[PDB]
Write a protein that binds this DNA or RNA. Structure first.
Ligand SMILES: [Mg+2]
Ligand SMILES: [Mg+2]
Ligand SMILES: [Mg+2]
Ligand SMILES: [Mg+2]
Ligand SMILES: [Mg+2]
Ligand SMILES: [Mg+2]
Ligand SMILES: [Mg+2]
Ligand SMILES: [Mg+2]
Ligand SMILES: [Mg+2]
Ligand SMILES: [Mg+2]
Ligand SMILES: [Mg+2]
Ligand SMILES: [Mg+2]
Ligand SMILES: [Mg+2]
Ligand SMILES: [Mg+2]
Ligand SMILES: [Mg+2]
Ligand SMILES: [Mg+2]
Ligand SMILES: [Mg+2]
Ligand SMILES: [Mg+2]
Ligand SMILES: [Mg+2]
Ligand SMILES: [Mg+2]
Ligand SMILES: [Mg+2]
Ligand SMILES: [Mg+2]
Ligand SMILES: [Mg+2]
Ligand SMILES: [Mg+2]
Ligand SMILES: [Mg+2]
Ligand SMILES: [Mg+2]
Ligand SMILES: [Mg+2]
Ligand SMILES: [Mg+2]
Ligand SMILES: [Mg+2]
Lengths: 77, 149
RNA sequence: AGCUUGACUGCGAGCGUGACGGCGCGAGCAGGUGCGAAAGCAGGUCAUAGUGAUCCGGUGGUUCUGAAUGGAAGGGCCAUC
RNA sequence: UUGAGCCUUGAUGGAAGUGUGGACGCCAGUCUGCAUGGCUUUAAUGUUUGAUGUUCUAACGUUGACCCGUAAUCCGGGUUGCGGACAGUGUCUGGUGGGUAGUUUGACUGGGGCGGUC
RNA sequence: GUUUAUUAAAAACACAGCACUGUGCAAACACGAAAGUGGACGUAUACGGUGUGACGCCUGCCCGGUGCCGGAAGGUUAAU
RNA sequence: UUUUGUAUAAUGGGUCAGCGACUUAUAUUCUGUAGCAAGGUUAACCGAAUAGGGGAGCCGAAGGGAAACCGAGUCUUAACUGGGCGUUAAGUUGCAGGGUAUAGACCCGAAACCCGGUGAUCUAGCCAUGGGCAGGUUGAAGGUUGGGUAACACUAACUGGAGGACCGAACCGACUAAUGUUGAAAAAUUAGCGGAUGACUUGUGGCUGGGGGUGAAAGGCCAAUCAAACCGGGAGAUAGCU
RNA sequence: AGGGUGACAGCCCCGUACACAAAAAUGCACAUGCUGUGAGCUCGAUGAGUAGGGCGGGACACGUGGUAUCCUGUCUGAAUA
RNA sequence: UAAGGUGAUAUGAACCGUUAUAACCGGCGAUUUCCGAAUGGGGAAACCCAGUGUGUUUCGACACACUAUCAUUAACUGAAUCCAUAGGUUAAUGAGGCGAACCGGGGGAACUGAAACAUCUAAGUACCCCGAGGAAAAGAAAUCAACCGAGAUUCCCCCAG
């Protein structure tokens, strides 16, 4: 499941559109990465499958606030 | 990704200065490894409240005993002296406990030789006012009365 | 051969010829011009081939339009590619 | 290490004698420093800003070895080793691309095609 | 030996053998959006692709065209 | 029926009976008719429900100009002797009908395209596990012993028991011919024919699925069909053709 | 109203108009109890990897157009009555 | 409720009833094999085979109940690593599957139309997929208007082909 654990980012659908303007179905899909975040609050490496951006959001909101979600959302981590 | 620092730190470090660093370096090294913290604004006061409750607080908490010499601005009662010699001139020296003898009952009682003037300590008249070690800054003033017996 | 720019601009009674789109001939009216002493003649070439609808787009002109209002963008009209 | 800026200490805008490297030096100077002796044309640092190169680890890879969950050739956590900001992946981009796809490939015509024509 | 079951069994396919060519192993290649898997529990005396098609005697000339291999100057050239 | 033309030896129909093709909806125009008339008429809705309310609105009574605008005129052009379009004929709402438009649009008919399922009980290939091959030949390596060499070579008996080896039943195949061809059979019989220890043959079970498989490669095979299976759906595909 | 009865039934039968009915289980209403549950005033606070932007797509009747508005794969990124 | 009854083809038999336990109707309960989500394991549905508790003047054995997975919670345990996390057992609750249309979302054709055909259409249609309700969905303005004002969403008729 290509899905960013922090921002729900799955892949999306769209056309390709040539010069001749030809529709062709395709997908846009997230820049995911799965990264080993250090928590300290837990003395452990929780390692989420995260899309860059999701990254930017951890870097802002804070891992403790992000893992706060999920926990509160049902997710594993 | 600005982040504020903890310990020193190579090419930016400063125990708490305001840096702006490549994200990587941070989330991959600095933080989760105790060395920095997001400049979460909540923090830019959390660690500025120190820059004020300290560098202008405990740097003023130092000044509560000006010169330490407060009401001792009129010299001190000369109990005894500090010695003499050479039938007129001077000869005797201050043992590692002998500048108190005179001012030996004023402030608080101690006994150490934090020597200040690395000379043969001039031998003449008697009464002199240099400074002595009262602290890492201020000074003090009193005199020295000899003993005729 | 001399002087010239009528290879003018706005219009056009009335005709031809086409299923149509369209093409064609046209005296004459207005403004303005050339030639001629004048009458007059010239809205290209003796005539009939020498070509490409519409869309989109360009350029010049033009307040005609212009989404609250003032402007502008874009649109129209005219000319032209 | 290196292209360029700013900050600077030496160049263009406590005397005289016994003594030294670099030089557009108006073609023949004098310097620019080296010892002493009763806002614009120039060299190094601190630097700010990009390029190139070594190396590093700590993202990331591990289809090496070990430990536990586990009597398990999955997996996961941990340790170690090798690699390492490379590889790879996301978005964007130029190239290739009958592998796959959707199509087009005119009419007249003494049958059609060829020729010719429009 | 195989083959058009059911109008063609052959001179067609295969074949041992021969060459060219790719592949250093998490191989190339192939199934598969992936994970996983064949190749292979193999490792260049192996594995894949193409052509030729026992054996004998042999396999000349041509690299313009097309294809393919190599080329750290220049010219042209994408996002940015 | 189709045709320039059909008794035509061109089409269709064995005969009967039943069924079997220009419909419906909404718009829009015209004719016919009816009401009202410079007017006509309401929709949703309300409802005391085929009334009555509701006039939102629609059409008409004014055009001209791209338009601003002007207005029985306006536009063209500086302006037109002028020229174009207009001012001189009543409309509107029902109802029936004729056309048209959108829809399966008079009825039946493709070959096909697309989506989702069902199929390796026939067949191709492969995997696992089991069975089968009467009889008769030929007689490779190697071995022993003799002879033989200086010794090897070499050579003769024997021994041995190879092989996509030979002949031939079972088994697998299918080269010729006749029969059959509303068959005994939707590939058969009959006489002959090739393989027959192998790249053989076969039983059970398993795996591969449709632009896919499998293929000693014929476009062959994938349930009597395959230049893209079968079933259902899109679906009344489309049919300027019959 | 309708149906049936040996042919067509107001008056033969079942019905029909009309008027009545539930020990039980339920539906919906209300009026109450229980567990909750919070009510009103005053003083505050007022939704950031967000709005916006580049790139690629998709929605808006609008097919990038002169194209506002919306969603977002990718890269970025404000102000704070 | 009642003077008749034991559904039908479908008689007959043996019976049950007649003033209230015949029958018939209706409300609530009881019983409810096996298979099937199927749930103790398996499996070629309706069959095979278990473990743990029970239970018999005949306590061998054979009857009766529970034992699936998943999630939230709790208790008891408990690694690499000593704490701690992971893991392990037990328990209480819930889920699971089925089915008309309507609905929200994820994904999404082609024939066809354009008298060919690619932008365009057919169409966000068919179909696949997930989810829910009695309805769903939407909803109380960073909405429109246009210098006057309106005042959420949803639906209908106009605007207007
Ligand atoms: Mg093709
Ligand atoms: Mg032709
Ligand atoms: Mg043969
Ligand atoms: Mg055949
Ligand atoms: Mg044959
Ligand atoms: Mg090979
Ligand atoms: Mg050959
Ligand atoms: Mg040959
Ligand atoms: Mg050759
Ligand atoms: Mg004929
Ligand atoms: Mg006749
Ligand atoms: Mg006939
Ligand atoms: Mg006849
Ligand atoms: Mg008939
Ligand atoms: Mg089989
Ligand atoms: Mg043989
Ligand atoms: Mg034989
Ligand atoms: Mg035979
Ligand atoms: Mg062929
Ligand atoms: Mg078949
Ligand atoms: Mg079909
Ligand atoms: Mg259709
Ligand atoms: Mg707000
Ligand atoms: Mg069971
Ligand atoms: Mg089961
Ligand atoms: Mg098509
Ligand atoms: Mg078409
Ligand atoms: Mg709701
Ligand atoms: Mg207001």
């Amino acid at each position: 499941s290509r899905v960013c654990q922090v921002t729900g980012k799955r892949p999306v659908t769209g056309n390709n559109r040539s010069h001749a303007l030809n529709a062709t179905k395709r997908r846009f899909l997230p820049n995911l990465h799965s990264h080993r975040f250090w928590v300290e609050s837990e003395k452990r490496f929780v390692t989420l499958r995260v899309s860059a951006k999701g990254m930017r959001v951890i870097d802002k909101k804070g891992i403790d606030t992000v893992l706060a979600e999920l926990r509160a959302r049902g997710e594993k981590y | 990704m600005q982040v504020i620092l903890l310990d020193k730190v190579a090419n930016l470090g400063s125990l708490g200065d305001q840096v702006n660093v490549k994200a990587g370096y941070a989330r991959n090294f600095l933080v989760p490894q105790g060395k920095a913290v997001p400049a979460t604004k909540k923090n830019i006061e959390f660690f500025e409240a120190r820059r004020a409750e300290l560098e202008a607080k405990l740097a003023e908490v130092l000044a509560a005993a000006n010169a330490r010499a407060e009401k001792i601005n009129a010299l001190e009662t000369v109990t005894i002296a500090s010695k003499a010699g050479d039938e007129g001139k001077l000869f005797g020296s201050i043992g590692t406990r002998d500048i108190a003898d005179a001012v030996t009952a004023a402030g608080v009682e101690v006994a150490k030789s934090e020597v200040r003037l690395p000379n043969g300590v001039l031998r003449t008249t008697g009464e002199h006012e240099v400074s002595f070690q009262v602290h890492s800054e201020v000074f003090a003033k009193v005199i020295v009365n000899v003993v005729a017996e």
